[PDB]
């Protein structure tokens, strides 16, 4: 796809990853985000045309798209543990409806198909990922939606999964418009996973989207950090400048260090602790509170950074800038 829906220059600023947290961000920052992010499952299309709230914030792409009619949509599509049945065609009617629905919004859509392709917890087979990316990239063309829907192959870039295993998941450059990654606690392995994902994207000639990012294990309102990924115990006080310097400055530095390929990010701005999947007593890891508006210094510094001219923010020229 040769730069289609990929900005020639600049980094798309998007926010996620549930309707309410995105509305709260837009309210608190007094801004219309350039891109907004939700999730849907392919088995039920849960979250596409009506509310789906399963403990990770409310998803409703119809509501989101009406609330932000001149912002890009970013959509994570879960395989719901069924990628092999998806690859064998059992959900093909649902795929068409998903693609036709998203194309009916007449705006740039970034589709993270089977996001975190190499996260073992997603139950994926390499075959099912390679086949289904082929099928979906081709179906976008068959349905006539290739000017509108950009297909993102997003890895998990998660330190406990060993490096050097990305090739088995790759469907081929002809079937991928962007590579994506997750930027949470890359310091746990010296940035090795996120750097490996970036260098993979670079080697394939694809732009890079940081599709999931948050100061994982930090609390912005409380100003704390924990080294405990499972339960968030023995929380450490941080100053707000420390929390900026420890997570936010390196996050933006990573984008500069990879500025040949980085063309978008999604910042997840949420009180994760308020959402039951991510809440105490932490059955699915410790996440924290990533709301930049919950600290004045973090909020100022955030707004000051993303207003800079390497970032693509919302304006009347946004869709043109993104290649729509
Ligand atoms: O301490 N940690 O390092 C830690 C511990 C756990 C943890 O949990 C995961 O958090 C990220 C979240 O994205 C994962 O969510 C799983 O996604 C897969 C789901 O699969 C469903 O399982 C039920 C099945 O019937 C259905 O077919 C299938 O789709 C699963 O439900 C989710 O739990 C968590 F697993 C993260 C971390 N860490 O962050 O620190
Ligand atoms: C990347 O790391 C951070 C996690 O928060 C992300 O997990 C996704 O968070 C948002 C949830 O809405 C999504 O949950 C899926 O939503 C669609 C449902 O059909 C599906 O059952 C549900 O798991 C999380 O995967 C992670 F990607």
């Amino acid at each position: 796809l040769d730069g289609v829906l990929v900005p020639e220059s600049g980094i798309l600023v998007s926010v996620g990853q549930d309707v309410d947290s995105v509305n709260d961000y837009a309210s608190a920052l007094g801004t219309i985000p350039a891109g907004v992010t939700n999730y849907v499952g392919i088995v039920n299309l849960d979250g596409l045309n009506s509310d789906a709230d399963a403990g990770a914030g409310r998803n409703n792409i119809a509501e989101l798209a009406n609330a932000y009619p001149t912002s890009a949509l970013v959509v994570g599509v879960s395989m719901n543990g069924e990628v092999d049945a998806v690859a064998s065609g059992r959900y093909n009617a649902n795929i068409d409806t998903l693609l036709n629905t998203l194309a009916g919004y007449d705006r740039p859509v970034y589709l993270r198909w089977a996001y975190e392709v190499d996260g073992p917890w997603n139950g994926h087979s390499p075959s099912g990922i390679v086949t289904s990316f082929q099928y979906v990239h081709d179906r976008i063309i068959a349905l006539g939606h290739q000017a509108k829907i950009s297909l993102v192959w997003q890895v998990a870039s998660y330190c406990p999964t060993p490096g050097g295993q990305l090739d088995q998941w790759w469907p081929g450059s002809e079937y991928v418009d962007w590579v994506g990654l997750s930027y949470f606690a890359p310091q746990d392995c010296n940035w090795d996973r996120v750097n490996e994902a970036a260098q993979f994207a670079r080697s394939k000639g694809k732009p890079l989207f940081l599709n999931e990012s948050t100061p994982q294990r930090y609390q912005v309102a409380d100003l704390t950090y924990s080294a405990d990924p499972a339960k968030g115990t023995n929380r450490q006080s941080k100053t707000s400048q420390q929390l900026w310097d420890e997570w936010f400055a390196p996050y933006f530095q990573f984008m500069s260090d990879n500025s040949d390929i980085v063309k978008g990010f999604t910042y997840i701005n949420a009180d994760w602790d308020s959402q039951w999947r991510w809440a105490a007593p932490y059955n699915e890891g410790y996440w924290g509170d990533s709301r930049v508006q919950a600290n004045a210094l973090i909020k100022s510094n955030w707004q000051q950074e993303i207003a800079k001219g390497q970032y693509i923010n919302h304006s009347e020229t946004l869709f043109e800038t993104l290649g729509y």
Side-chain angles (χ1 to χ4, degrees), residues 59-143:
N59 292 274
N60 184 333
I61 289 160
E63 183 177 319
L64 188 73
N66 176 81
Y68 296 98
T70 64
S71 300
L73 289 162
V74 184
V75 176
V77 186
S78 174
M79 301 298 93
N80 302 123
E82 299 294 334
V83 76
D84 282 339
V86 173
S88 73
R90 302 280 187 179
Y91 297 102
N92 284 353
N94 292 4
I95 294 172
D96 283 352
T97 296
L98 177 57
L99 294 178
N100 287 329
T101 295
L102 292 173
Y105 288 126
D106 296 340
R107 65 193 68 165
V109 175
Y110 297 94
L111 190 71
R112 304 147 58 198
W113 177 261
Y115 57 89
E116 296 195 320
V117 297
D118 58 347
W121 54 87
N122 283 331
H124 300 152
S125 64
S127 190
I129 290 290
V130 165
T131 294
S132 67
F133 267 85
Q134 176 183 59
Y135 178 84
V136 172
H137 198 278
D138 286 348
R139 196 66 175 153
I140 290 166
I141 291 159
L143 295 171

